[PDB]
């Protein structure tokens, strides 16, 4: 079942843990994705 | 044997060859000579 589910992408990327990242790498990737959002650390116009 | 009284003038400490012990001096009454 897992071989099939990886053959045809039944599980979208957000499903974790994947066979590519250890959980600490998952945390690092989450932090990096949060940081890499376009103008995520903006508070001049009150966005949160 | 259960249900039988002790013989008169018998020391249960004796009659068996038993010997006591003294782990310390704080326990037990003072030995009398």
């Amino acid at each position: 079942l897992w071989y099939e589910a990886d053959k045809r992408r039944l599980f979208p990327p957000w499903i974790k843990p994947a066979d590519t990242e250890p959980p600490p790498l998952l945390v690092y990737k989450w932090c990096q994705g949060i940081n890499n959002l376009q103008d995520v650390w903006e508070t001049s116009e009150g966005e949160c | 044997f259960l249900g039988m009284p002790a013989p008169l003038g018998y020391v249960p400490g004796l009659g068996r060859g038993a010997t006591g012990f003294t782990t310390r001096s704080d326990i037990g009454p003072a030995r009398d000579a």
């Binding site: 932090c31 949060i34 940081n35 890499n36 650390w41 | -």
Partner: protein, 48 residues
């Protein structure tokens, strides 16, 4: 950031309290289950 390539954010890490509790519980059950157990087994469990 993947565009500015600058230090936009700072990430401070910490070990979760649940993880510390789990580790303490593991060490406690290693120790308390050592009445009849070789020293090498205890040291290997602690090392692991």
């Amino acid at each position: 950031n993947e565009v500015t390539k600058e230090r936009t954010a700072q990430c401070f890490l910490r070990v979760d309290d649940e993880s510390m509790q789990r580790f303490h519980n593991r060490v406690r059950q290693i120790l308390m289950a050592s009445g009849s157990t070789t020293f090498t087994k205890i040291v290997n469990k602690w090392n692991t």
